[PDB]
RNA sequence: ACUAUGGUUUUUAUU
RNA sequence: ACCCGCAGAAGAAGCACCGGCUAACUCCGUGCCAGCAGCCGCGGUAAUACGGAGGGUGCAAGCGUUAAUCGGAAUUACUGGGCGUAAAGCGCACGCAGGCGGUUUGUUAAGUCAGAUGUGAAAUCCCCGGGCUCAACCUGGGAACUGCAUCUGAUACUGGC
RNA sequence: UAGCUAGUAGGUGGGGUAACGGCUCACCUAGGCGACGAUCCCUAGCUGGUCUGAGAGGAUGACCAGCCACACUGGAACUG
């Protein structure tokens, strides 16, 4: 493994994919205050059991489609 | 202004206004010249002074100052203009060049004789 | 460039004899030196400190014959490695080949020495040097070439130097017209230990 | 003896009924050359009588400040009526630096040089008051020393 | 304010010096107690005690020594509105070394003198002189 | 407080 | 390149500036004109400011006259503002993405901090050595490129559990 | 400047290359981007660096070293 993250599902409208939101966790480079900053990943998932608002664990890979370079590992917390 | 505002979107300088945008930020600019006439300054500085109406190479016309004694400038003569600040004579931010193109220099300069493109004393 | 024209005007502005036309015409002055630069000074005196600072900027460089750009270029090497710029600058100006050839006695002025250096007559470390922008190394040899040793102007420069005191930071054998430069001098040994508050603020802004 | 320095003197115009009348006003500092200082201001007729009045008021507004061998160890701030001054320790480079009131006040006090800047109201008669407030904003001479032991 | 427990300690001491008081009492916390113990160690207080019946109150006895004042500086550095963190070689040096800076560290509240000798960095809480 | 009322004077050396 | 000679001062000095800021002085002419000018301001009968002067100052193969991009400018404010009245507190309460969050133990190491392995090419400021007649130039070395990665580690506090 | 996007976002079957991929053909879906600024306009090639200033942050990427793109203009092919 090279990169592995946790984030929250925001779109489940796909049969072999999901859209996951992740945080930057960053100091603003001139105003010095900390910010969350939400960035999106389109993630591979062939099981199709994780859903919107659930918390997921994801891993970085070689490209599987255009704009699709990550794949699902686990469902961490279930939001019902 | 707050950091929570500047982190969401930065704010912009307002505005430092430009003096002579008709010169295209060049050190000199050319123009064709129409009419040459006398104009009067603000009365505390009372005198007569001379100007010309100069359409440039670009879309703009300016009222340009003529320094130095001698009237022989003509229409469609094609002359050079420089930005030069005049604050007691109406609408003038611009000076004519005597030392270049279809302009004449000034006679009998006793002091500061390199002005107006005037050469070494021989006359 | 360098200055050209009437010379007594120069000694009059410096308030001091410059060895310019200073034979029997120097004896008990009567030449406006120490009296009258220009012609005015006593009736509408402004006494401006910018004028004394401008006077110091002329005064400090004209003694060495160096121009403004040359003087600020030595000041660039005095202002690095902390301040104390007046003492650190002294070591650079006193290390010049025209100043060293004048202190070895071969010229009656630094300009006469600078004009002997241009005339191919001076050699340092065994080779010929014709620039005054050189800097002499400690325990290195400075010498004059044979075809200049009998010149009436140089004869008179060593004749003037042997009627004055010796600088201790070099030595020369008059039986060879050759010897070594020991060290760059110290501002408190070359004159006295004092503070000059203008030279430490001189040039820039 | 208390040592003197002139900061400024100038002619002052006043337009009255039918004409102008002229005066002179002087800005001065007086100190002991070790740690005691005061600033003076005064209007009169002719320069030497305006300086005389200003020097007489400098000798009436004095303050006494203790400094370890005349140094300003730390960065220090002076305030008076919207005039602000800030002083910083140097690096033995150019070192001096700063002019007018921020040069003269420390000179008649015999105090070692600092890097200095003014803010707010730049009028000299209140900037000088901020400079002698910043002199009093400095710590005890000598304090650590016995406040905290090695 | 409940949003900051350090202003609740520092400004009580500046207002107590402005009131020229010998002792100051505050609502307690492990962090206020850890800071009181190092203010005793660095010679700004002579005593700290925690007393109460249903909630703890921390009472500090201020160490003025030989004249007026206990602080020339008591300045807040890191805050809830802006965090301030330094590495071991970027540690501040308060008032030409006349003052101290207070550092958080993974090993517990210490001086910049102690953090520099340990070879550590962290959050800079305040400056004291 | 102690009668309810009455408009205009060219820009100008210029201190 | 370098070396030695053959002729003759011969082939060579400009340009603003001089009331005050701003160093250089104040005679006569003009009489709000003619002109000056960066800023302040000057010009109607001795004008220190124009013209005309003779003298005087400063840079110098440059000197004056400008433009670009910055500085002075906190004049977009992190460092570093303004809102009672000198610009602007929005008429009041309700809800809300975001910003801040008691008092403690345990867990995590994302923030942070520590130590390693890399990468930040060569050139370059800074700093130490050497050679070209000096510097530039040609360069031997050390700093630095505050970072961004790959391990290992502390665990106080913010975040997460 | 508030909308912009039908190969755009996603699926299901077949192909092409030295390899990635809606690279490409077909059958189905309504997604995706956008106030942390999409659409659109003026301006501008990227980095090492250069460089103003107290410094921040900008400005500036002629020279030397390494990338991008152009070869009057547009669009293809042949060959390695």
UniProtKB/Swiss-Prot annotation, chain B:
Organism: Escherichia coli (strain K12)
GO MF term set: misfolded RNA binding; rRNA binding; structural constituent of ribosome; tRNA binding
Role played: With S4 and S5 plays an important role in translational accuracy.
Family, similarity comment: Belongs to the universal ribosomal protein uS12 family.
Keyword Cell membrane attached: no
GO cellular component: cytoplasm; cytosol; cytosolic small ribosomal subunit; ribosome
Keyword tRNA-binding: yes
Keywords carried by this UniProt record: Acetylation, Antibiotic resistance, Methylation, Ribonucleoprotein, Ribosomal protein, RNA-binding, rRNA-binding, tRNA-binding
Modified residues (N6-acetyllysine): 107
Residues with PTM 3-methylthioaspartic acid: 88
InterPro entries, A to Z: NA-bd_OB-fold, Ribosomal_uS12, Ribosomal_uS12_bac
Record-given protein name: Small ribosomal subunit protein uS12
Subunit note: Part of the 30S ribosomal subunit. Contacts proteins S8 and S17. Interacts with ArfA. May interact with IF1 in the 30S initiation complex.
Further facts: At least 19 substitutions or deletions in 11 codons can promote streptomycin resistance, dependence or pseudodependence; all but one of the streptomycin resistant mutations (K42R) are associated with hyperaccurate translation and thus reduced translational efficiency.
Swiss-Prot record, chain C:
Ribonucleoprotein recorded as keyword: yes
Keyword annotations from UniProtKB, A to Z: Antibiotic resistance, Repressor, Ribonucleoprotein, Ribosomal protein, Ribosome biogenesis, RNA-binding, rRNA-binding, Transcription, Transcription antitermination, Transcription regulation, Transcription termination, Translation regulation
Regions annotated as coiled coil: none
InterPro entries named in the record: Ribosomal_uS4 (IPR022801), Ribosomal_uS4_bac-type (IPR005709), Ribosomal_uS4_CS (IPR018079), Ribosomal_uS4_N (IPR001912), S4_RNA-bd (IPR002942), S4_RNA-bd_sf (IPR036986)
Alphabetized Gene3D superfamilies for the sequence: Ribosomal Protein S4 Delta 41, Chain A, domain 1, RNA-binding S4 domain
GO cellular component: cytoplasm; cytosol; cytosolic small ribosomal subunit; small ribosomal subunit
UniProt GO molecular function: mRNA 5'-UTR binding; mRNA regulatory element binding translation repressor activity; rRNA binding; structural constituent of ribosome
Domain S4 RNA-binding stretches: 95-155
GO biological process, alphabetically ordered: cytoplasmic translation; DNA-templated transcription termination; maintenance of translational fidelity; negative regulation of translational initiation; response to antibiotic; ribosomal small subunit assembly; ribosomal small subunit biogenesis; transcription antitermination
PANTHER family membership: 30S 40S RIBOSOMAL PROTEIN, SMALL RIBOSOMAL SUBUNIT PROTEIN US4M
Family: Belongs to the universal ribosomal protein uS4 family.
Function comment: One of two assembly initiator proteins for the 30S subunit, it binds directly to 16S rRNA where it nucleates assembly of the body of the 30S subunit.
Curated annotation (Swiss-Prot), chain D:
One GO term (biological process): maintenance of translational fidelity
Keywords recorded for this protein, A-Z: Acetylation, Antibiotic resistance, Ribonucleoprotein, Ribosomal protein, RNA-binding, rRNA-binding
GO annotations of cellular component type: cytoplasm; cytosol; cytosolic small ribosomal subunit
Claim: Ion transport is one of the keywords in the record: no
Molecular-function GO term, any one: structural constituent of ribosome
Effect upon mutating residue 13 to P: In strain: SPCR13 and SPCR15; spectinomycin resistant. Not a ram mutation
SUPFAM superfamilies, sorted: dsRNA-binding domain-like (SSF54768), Ribosomal protein S5 domain 2-like (SSF54211)
Function: With uS4 and uS12 plays an important role in translational accuracy. Many suppressors of streptomycin-dependent mutants of protein uS12 are found in this protein, some but not all of which decrease translational accuracy (ram, ribosomal ambiguity mutations).
Further remarks about this protein from its record: Altered uS5 proteins have been identified in a number of mutants. Some mutations in uS5 have been shown to increase translational error frequencies.
Family the entry assigns: Belongs to the universal ribosomal protein uS5 family.
Domain note: The N-terminal domain interacts with the head of the 30S subunit; the C-terminal domain interacts with the body and contacts protein uS4. The interaction surface between uS4 and uS5 is involved in control of translational fidelity.
HAMAP family, alphabetized: Ribosomal_uS5_B (MF_01307_B)
Protein name: Small ribosomal subunit protein uS5
Organism: Escherichia coli (strain K12)
Gene this chain is encoded by: rpsE
From Swiss-Prot, chain E:
Any single GO BP term: regulation of translation
Keywords: Repressor, Ribonucleoprotein, Ribosomal protein, RNA-binding, rRNA-binding, Translation regulation
PROSITE patterns registered for this protein in UniProt: RIBOSOMAL_S8
GO CC terms in record: cytoplasm; cytosol; cytosolic small ribosomal subunit
Pfam annotation, one family: Ribosomal_S8
Domain of life according to the entry: Bacteria
Family annotation (InterPro entries): Ribosomal_uS8 (IPR000630), Ribosomal_uS8_CS (IPR047863), Ribosomal_uS8_sf (IPR035987)
Record-level Gene Ontology MF annotations: rRNA binding; structural constituent of ribosome
Assembly information from the UniProt record: Part of the 30S ribosomal subunit. Contacts proteins S5 and S12.
Family recorded in the similarity comment: Belongs to the universal ribosomal protein uS8 family.
Function recorded in the entry: One of the primary rRNA binding proteins, it binds directly to 16S rRNA central domain where it helps coordinate assembly of the platform of the 30S subunit. Protein S8 is a translational repressor protein, it controls the translation of the spc operon by binding to its mRNA.
Protein name (Swiss-Prot/TrEMBL): Small ribosomal subunit protein uS8
Source organism of this protein record: Escherichia coli (strain K12)
């Amino acid at each position: 493994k090279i990169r592995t993250l946790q984030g929250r599902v925001v779109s489940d409208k796909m049969e072999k994919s999901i859209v996951v939101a992740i945080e930057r966790f960053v100091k603003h480079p001139i105003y010095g205050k900390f910010i969350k900053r939400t960035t999106k990943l389109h993630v591979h998932d062939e099981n199709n059991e994780c859903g919107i608002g659930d918390v997921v664990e994801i891993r970085e890979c070689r490209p599987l489609s255009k704009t699709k370079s990550w794949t699902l590992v686990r469902v961490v917390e279930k939001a019902v | 202004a707050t950091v929570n505002q500047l982190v969401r979107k930065p704010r912009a300088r307002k505005v430092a206004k430009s003096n002579v945008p008709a010169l295209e930020a060049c050190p000199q600019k050319r123009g064709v010249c129409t009419r040459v006439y006398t104009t009067t300054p603000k009365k505390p500085n009372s005198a007569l002074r001379k100007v010309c109406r100069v359409r440039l190479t670009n879309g703009f016309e300016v009222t340009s100052y003529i320094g130095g004694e001698g009237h022989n400038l003509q229409e469609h003569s094609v002359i050079l203009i420089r930005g030069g600040r005049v604050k007691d004579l109406p609408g003038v931010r611009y000076h004519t060049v005597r030392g270049a193109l279809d302009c004449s220099g000034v006679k009998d300069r006793k002091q500061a004789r390199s002005k107006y493109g005037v050469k070494r004393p021989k006359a | 460039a360098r200055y050209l024209g009437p010379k007594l005007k120069l000694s009059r502005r410096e308030g001091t004899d410059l060895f310019l036309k200073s034979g029997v015409r120097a004896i008990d002055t009567k030449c406006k030196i120490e009296q009258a630069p220009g012609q005015h000074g006593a009736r509408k005196p402004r006494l401006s400190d910018y004028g004394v600072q401008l006077r110091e900027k002329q005064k400090v460089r004209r003694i060495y014959g160096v121009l403004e750009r040359q003087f600020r270029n030595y000041y660039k090497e005095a202002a690095r490695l902390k301040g104390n710029t007046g003492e650190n600058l002294l070591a650079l100006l006193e290390g010049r080949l025209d100043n060293v050839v004048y202190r070895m006695g071969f010229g009656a002025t630094r300009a006469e020495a600078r004009q002997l250096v241009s005339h191919k007559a001076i050699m340092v470390n065994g080779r010929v040097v014709n620039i005054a922008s050189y800097q002499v190394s400690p325990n290195d040899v400075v010498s004059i070439r044979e075809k200049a040793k009998k010149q009436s102007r140089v004869k008179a420069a060593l004749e003037l130097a042997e009627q004055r005191e010796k600088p201790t930071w070099l030595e020369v054998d008059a039986g060879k017209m050759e010897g070594t430069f020991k060290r760059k001098p110290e501002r408190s040994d070359l004159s006295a230990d004092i503070n000059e508050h203008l030279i430490v603020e001189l040039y820039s802004k | 003896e208390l040592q003197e320095k002139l900061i400024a003197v100038n002619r002052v115009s006043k337009t009255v009924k039918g004409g102008r009348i002229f005066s002179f006003t002087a800005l001065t500092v007086v100190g002991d050359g070790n740690g005691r200082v005061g600033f003076g201001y005064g209007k009169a007729r002719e320069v030497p009588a305006a300086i005389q009045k200003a020097m007489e008021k400098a000798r009436r507004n004095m303050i006494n400040v203790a400094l370890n061998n005349g140094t300003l160890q730390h960065p220090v701030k002076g305030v008076h009526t919207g005039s602000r001054v800030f002083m910083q320790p140097a690096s033995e480079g150019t070192g001096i630096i700063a002019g007018g009131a921020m040069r003269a006040v420390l000179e008649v006090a015999g105090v070692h040089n600092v890097l200095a800047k003014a803010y707010g109201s730049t009028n000299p008669i209140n900037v000088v008051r901020a400079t002698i407030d910043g002199l009093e904003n400095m710590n005890s001479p000598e304090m650590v020393a016995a406040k905290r032991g090695k | 304010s409940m949003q900051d427990p350090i202003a609740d300690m520092l400004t009580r001491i500046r207002n107590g010096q402005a009131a020229n008081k010998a002792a100051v009492t505050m609502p307690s916390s492990k962090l206020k107690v850890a800071i009181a113990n190092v203010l005793k160690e660095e010679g700004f207080i002579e005593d700290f005690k925690v007393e109460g019946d249903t909630k703890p109150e921390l009472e500090l006895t201020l160490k003025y020594f030989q004249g007026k004042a206990v602080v020339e500086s008591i300045q807040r550095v890191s805050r809830p509105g802006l965090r301030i963190y330094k590495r071991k070689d970027e540690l501040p040096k308060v008032m030409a070394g006349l003052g101290i800076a207070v550092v958080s560290t993974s090993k517990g509240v210490m001086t910049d003198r102690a953090a520099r000798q340990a070879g550590l960095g962290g959050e800079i809480i305040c400056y004291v002189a």
